[PDB]
Amino acid sequence: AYTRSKIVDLVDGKIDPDTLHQMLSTPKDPERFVTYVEILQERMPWDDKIILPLGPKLFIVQQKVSKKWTVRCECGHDFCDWKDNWKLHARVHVRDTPQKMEEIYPRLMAPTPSWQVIREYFCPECGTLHDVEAPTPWYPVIHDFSPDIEGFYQEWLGLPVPERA
Amino acid sequence: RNVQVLGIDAGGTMTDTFFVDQDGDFVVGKAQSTPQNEALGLIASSEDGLANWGMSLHEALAQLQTGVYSGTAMLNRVVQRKGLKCGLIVNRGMEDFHRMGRAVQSHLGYAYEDRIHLNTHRYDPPLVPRHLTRGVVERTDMMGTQVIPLREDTARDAARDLIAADAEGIVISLLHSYKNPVNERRVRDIVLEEVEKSGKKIPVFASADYYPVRKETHRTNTTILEGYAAEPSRQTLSKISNAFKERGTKFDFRVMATHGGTISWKAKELARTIVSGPIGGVIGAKYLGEVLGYKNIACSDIGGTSFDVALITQGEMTIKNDPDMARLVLSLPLVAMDSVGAGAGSFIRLDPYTRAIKLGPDSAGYRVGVCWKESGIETVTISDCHMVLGYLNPDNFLGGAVKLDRQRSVDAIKAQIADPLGLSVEDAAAGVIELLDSDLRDYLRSMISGKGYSPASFVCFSYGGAGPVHTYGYTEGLGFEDVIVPAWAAGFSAFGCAAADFEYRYDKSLDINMPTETPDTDKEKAAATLQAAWEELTKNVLEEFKLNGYSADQVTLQPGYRMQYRGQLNDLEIESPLAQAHTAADWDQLTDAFNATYGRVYAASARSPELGYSVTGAIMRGMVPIPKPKIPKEPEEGETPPESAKIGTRKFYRKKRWVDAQLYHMESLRPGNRVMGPAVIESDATTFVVPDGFETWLDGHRLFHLREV
Amino acid sequence: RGIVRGGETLKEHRDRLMAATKATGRYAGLKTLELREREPILYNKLFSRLRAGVVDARETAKKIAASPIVEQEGELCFTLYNAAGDSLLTSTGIIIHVGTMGAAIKYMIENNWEANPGVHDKDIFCNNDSLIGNVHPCDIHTIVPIFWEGELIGWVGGVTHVIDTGAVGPGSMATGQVQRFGDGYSITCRKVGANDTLFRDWLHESQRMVRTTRYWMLDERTRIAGCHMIRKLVEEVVAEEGIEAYWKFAYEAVEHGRLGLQARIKAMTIPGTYRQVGFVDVPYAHEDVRVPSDFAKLDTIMHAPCEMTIRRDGTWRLDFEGSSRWGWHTYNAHQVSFTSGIWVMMTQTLIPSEMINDGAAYGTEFRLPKGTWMNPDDRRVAFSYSWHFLVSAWTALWRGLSRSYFGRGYLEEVNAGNANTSNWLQGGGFNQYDEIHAVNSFECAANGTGATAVQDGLSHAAAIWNPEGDMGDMEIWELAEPLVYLGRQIKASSGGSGKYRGGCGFESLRMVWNAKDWTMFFMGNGHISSDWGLMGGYPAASGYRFAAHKTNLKELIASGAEIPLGGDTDPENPTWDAMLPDAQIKRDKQAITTEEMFSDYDLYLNYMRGGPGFGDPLDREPQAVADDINGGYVLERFAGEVYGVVVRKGADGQYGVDETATAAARAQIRKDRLAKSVPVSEWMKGEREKILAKDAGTQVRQMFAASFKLGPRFEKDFRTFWDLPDSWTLPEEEIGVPTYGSRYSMDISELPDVHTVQFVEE
Amino acid sequence: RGIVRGGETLKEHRDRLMAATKATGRYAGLKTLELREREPILYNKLFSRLRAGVVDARETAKKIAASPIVEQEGELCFTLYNAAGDSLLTSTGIIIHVGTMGAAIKYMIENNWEANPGVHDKDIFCNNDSLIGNVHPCDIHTIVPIFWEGELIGWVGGVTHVIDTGAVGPGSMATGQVQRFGDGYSITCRKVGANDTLFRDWLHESQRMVRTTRYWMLDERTRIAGCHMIRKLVEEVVAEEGIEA
Ligand SMILES: Nc1ncnc2c1ncn2[C@@H]1O[C@H](COP(=O)(O)O)[C@@H](O)[C@H]1O
Ligand SMILES: [Mg+2]
Ligand SMILES: [Mg+2]
Ligand SMILES: [Mg+2]
Ligand SMILES: [Mg+2]
Ligand SMILES: [Mg+2]
Ligand SMILES: [Mg+2]
Ligand SMILES: [Mn+2]
Ligand SMILES: [Mn+2]
Ligand SMILES: [Zn+2]
């Protein structure tokens, strides 16, 4: 096991080089997930239980009263049911002209928008950027990850599945 | 007694000396190092060593035939990153090349596993930061042809910029200057003019004057080290040479170089001796291994400032051209070794934001730690943890010549480390030692794994003053065939210097290019060119032996050459089967000897004679005999130490438990004796720690063997 | 009597082992590992000696070579195989060839090389044929059988990347040809020697079918040296420890590898379904792509979608249904090279501390539909720059695996993905030694790496095909190319923006010097960045071309005028162009060309790509933005717009952070993002209208049309997602571009006596 | 011991003959022709049988081919050589290859093919390399040595024009490429078989480096047939009339 402090430093991007190399080069600590989720839980401005982190500010959570599972932003906004694609319920900005590409890359280093566009997906409450896709024109919105949460908790971690409606 | 050979290991916390007599008998001296003038501690160490034979310095110094210096002063500047503040002048447009590290510096010194595990890769900060780097407009091609003439105004502005930025030294390295040095030397002269007008003391180092070899990354790093690490030691050898001559010596000092042979103390290029001390250690290990039958040895040495590791495989050291060390590509031919900033004097600090413990890379060195009240050291060190935990004896540090106060270590660890972390003093100190043991263990393992081996293929040798203090920890669970601590661990590098052959060597580059079949005239001309180089290098070798009082008929000469197939980037060193070369048949014999060696180094099917041959250099070595140190061979007595070897008990803390460790006088233990941990086996300049869960036994060669139980 | 130890034929032996693997789910039916479990000390000793032997062969034999690609960069590999062609242990380096050389051995097994031409002690085989699995013709294999007491007990393979193989274009990653015909000298498991001696007919022929003859010859001696070093070591190990122990290790080591992957998957990941995609551009319509076949003149885009499934039992599956078709270019691949590269990626993240051998391939399922670019069904395809497509598809798999790591808390392992490994500086003609020559710079061994969940990526550091990156010394490249350096600089604003920034690439400016009758060309991604950022991060920058002819630099140098040096710091605001008022300058997005005449004093920019970013850039530490501007990693103008960080230049010339103005700028950007964006349903409504109207360029429409035909599940997904009516169709023939090879194809297995080895579902 | 009848190496034998040609102005230094002048009936009998043999090889073996270029048009040739690679007799057809196939044999002589890869009874060589004298890559040569009582006494060459050799352009007289690189599959005096049997590595490689694979395969069997028909006839003639004649 690593100490709670070292896992805090890992989450914050402040971990020391010796501990980071130890984490990379030696067999994994099985206790990581339970400690990680506890650290994240303590930072949230709401008390609904985190079930699985999807990004730095994005989570599958258990609703305190209904016990439904939803995708939630750190600020509190619920997008949708945990099996649906949160992006279909987000806001999007599409860079599909040379002016829009040149805001974020120098001319010539920028992609050409008739070949590739940049699609930025935001939380509608706080404006956090949770994902950036870079496909062709016409490409479907991608449903990035459908986790087997039942299998993960019961078979790999040896924990019961949290209550769910 | 007729004392004939002296070996030295300076620049650590303690300066060690090693004396050999005409029968091969030896004694070891110790004293506190004196970095303002190393000669003072060296004289004191010498008197301490010779007192074991009831002999005075005056008596012995007159008898000595040779002396070999080694040390760590320069290496310590590299591993701590505490050197002279150098600026760098390169070609305009290529200022970034140094800090980019050629990419390769992000994965040097890594295990097999870490070479492929991408997220472990990491760049260390450069020797010269970007803001202390400037560029001149110039280009010279690989033929020596000027493409872009030097624009002298750009050299002047570069110089003035680095002077205004408070550079303490300036390094110059332009592309292909080894081929045509004209432009680089003019930039040097212009930099020297601007320094003169400034009135400041700023030495200047042009790469072509020191390391004129191809590969700008390697050459530029090496030339930087000449300023950064070597320059503050520039006068050390002449002070030593004078102190010894005043006291009656008649020999000319030699110094251990990177390639495992010695050179003159008068060498202009000091970075050639940057790892003299660790290389002395490897030579010692190879010699001990040859006498006792150890073919595969993992060398390991802790001192006050560094941890040094090296591999001997199938009885050979492996000398590598264009090597790396300390995660730097270098131009010095090097026996395979590496070194890192972790030692018994390393400072311990808490991160102000995370409270993570950080060890080193800087060290108190000769000042030890807070426990030495006269040091003036305020920041706790690893030595302070040794005092708290009972690893070392406060009353027998340098044989009792330096008094240490455990209570000062307790108080300072409490204020700096333990109270801020919410720990007891002993848990804070034990936690520091856990971190050290694990860091050193991983460093040793990584050296072995980088060659593809497992530690089970090796025997570990553990030496240096502090090596035996942590052997239990840095070898734990690695599975070495055996783990060995020589009783003379503190003087092991000085031992190696004394065991070195009394040999001088000189080299010269050549450019002889020959098709597969050529007429006899071409072969005669090639032979004459090589012969002229051998005659010149023979004078250099013999002149050096003359300074030591040996005439030419006492010296054995061995000519050599460097050869390759045409178009290759690398060459092989071949020992000549001829003492001189003149005829077409002689040339054929030299090309045949190369083909046969190439077949052994690589494979018979790799030979490519159809491409023709290039001779790229000539070599001459000279040797005279001296006595070697005699390795003890005593018969084994019983398993039980005599009662008179016991010298008390001391409270000892590890894995959350206090125990009473049994103390033994090292030199009172007998061949055959077994000691069960917890125990501490104490000499006057080393300490061998045997915790609970370990055991050691002593053989007839004065070697301890360490085992887990 | 068969030649394998015990008397089985090669084919009988392999077939028995594959049947037991299929029946039991364990390599060779090994339910226990007797040597490992009962004799652990001997198992470890064989591991240690043999792994050290293969590492030593690479380290030592590379000193034979004249080519810096092999001698300095270390683009070579040596691998030890069991009798069935499965790898036990390997050196590091270009380890994609662990799989390619084993697949070549399996081709010999399956096509009865044992009966003709025979497999005899001291034989030498040579091979580079991409139709049986190799990356491209420039990776040459030497394969030697290993015998003990007159029976075969294994093989050793050695590979070197050579400078050229005599393709139409002068370089390793060549353009010009559009088919196998002109794609380079191609050798199919040829017996090139016996009694340890190379045949003279082979030597004379091979040496005249390439430009870089002397370099070719020393690369060959390099491979044979390492093969014979390893053969000798195996003979010594068997003599000392006995054939019985070695024979057990030679199969147990593979199953140990499979067990290692399964355990690492269950320790590090999360079971589930992960979906991701990659693309790259092929701008062949441009006039500076002078191909000799009119059916190849069109703009296309590579498509590589991947459905990744991690199962509860620790197995996993990668399915590439929906991918685009092979084409008339040099970017096609093969099931072996495609899946071997995924194995290479695994070695850098999942299994770096397990056994590195074929075991992990047996623990992975792959589905590559027949006729896609990664599993082509036509024997005419070209391969010289296979990597263009390969590196652009593999990068997306890092993102999927990283979601598992991130969810579970193993943040140290997250990586947003690999850079596109380009540009490749290439060309040919007469060099400084007055000989026929070609160049192929390996500066793009040192590209930016993807950011992690904990820290920035590394600049100018690695490539997906070799994590031990090396850019080489300028002075060494100058011995092997008639070119001189006028710059080498970190590439500002190339690394992908994020909370953690992707690694930057680097750039070098070259001037032509002491060349005669000389040509050069460009090869890399242009219009499209293949990598994507992760969890809010952005892709690295994409590619462009800079070259200058008739520069007048001889006179400008002599007169003391300003001359171009360094890097092209801001290509939107360049400084070099105004210094060359008489030059013909090409500065544009055309990152792929065929050979063009260059003369002494002309200029060429070599630009190496960066890697992708991680997280919302608005969460980056403000001091790290200021450090990046001061260090040359990021151009000043992007601090405000991308990261919301306000910097200002102090008295010392260094940029520093305004912490108050930065907090206000970030609060304001959050509001800007809400104001400029729309609900995703609303954006979808407008994009759907364009799809219904067929409003996209021909390159976009061709990509979807070809993908739909090879991947009906993908067509169904697309129609459902966009709610398209059955009256909407996208036939490739209605686009107006050539479609040769869309319907008619002939596979290599249709030729007489050819038996191909199957490694994937198709 | 050299492999030519009498014990000379191939190179020793040819060098002796070329030196005598230069010194005397007559081929091989032959100032008189003993067989022709003293045994005219036997000279004519050998001429008649061997010329009929080479003519018959072309007429018969062409019926193997699928390509009309060979089977109907007759764009093939078979030629009989002495040990030094000089032609004695030939079929009609594409007889420019009398010179090209002899020059390929002389390249083997001059570059010590005798020592490596060796020239053995029942070997099969293939060649089309224009750098050593051929017209173009589409004219493929099969060359077989002829032995009598363990020593080399001659060679037989057979050529067919094949449809394509996998150049950039699709055809025999192709455009598109501008250099050797892309000019077609080029074979330099390769040993492609032994004990009268083609090697499988050669078969698999060659067949995938051309467009017209099946046509290529039958053109190869055409060349081997005629070479072996002529070898057999030479063995019969020597058995009947004696090696000295
Ligand atoms: N009795 C002792 N006196 C002095 N140093 C000792 C003793 N026992 C062990 N050492 C170690 O030897 C180290 C000096 O190593 P060096 O820098 O090689 O002289 C010290 O830092 C100690 O940790
Ligand atoms: Mg010391
Ligand atoms: Mg030491
Ligand atoms: Mg460490
Ligand atoms: Mg190494
Ligand atoms: Mg709005
Ligand atoms: Mg088939
Ligand atoms: Mn390659
Ligand atoms: Mn023809
Ligand atoms: Zn939000």
Numbering used by the authors:
A (entry chain F): 2 to 166
B (entry chain E): 9 to 717
C (entry chain D): 15 to 776
D (entry chain A): 15 to 259
Quote the study on this structure:
ACs contain metal ions but not organic cofactors, and use ATP to activate substrates through phosphorylation. The first structural rationale for acetone carboxylation is presented here, focusing on the 360 kDa (αβγ)2 heterohexameric AC from Xanthobacter autotrophicus in the ligand-free, AMP-bound, and acetate coordinated states. Like many carboxylases, AC is a heteromultimeric enzyme complex. Its architecture consists of two heterotrimeric αβγ subunits joined by the interacting α-subunits to form a dimeric core.
To examine the proposed ligand exchange mechanism at the Mn catalytic site, the acetate/AMP-bound structure of AC was characterized. Acetate was used as a product analog because of the instability of the native product acetoacetate in aqueous solution. In this structure, acetate is bound at the Mn site and α-Glu89 resumes its position oriented away from the Mn. The collapse of this channel is apparent in the acetate/AMP-bound structure, which shows a reorganized Mn-proximal α-helix in addition to movement of α-Glu89. Such collapse would prevent the diffusion of intermediates away from the Mn. (d) Our acetate/AMP bound structure describes two intermediates or possibly the acetoacetate product electrostatically displacing Glu89, which results in the formation of the Mn-proximal α-helix. This switch triggers the closing of the interior channel and the reopening of the substrate channel for nucleotide departure and new access.
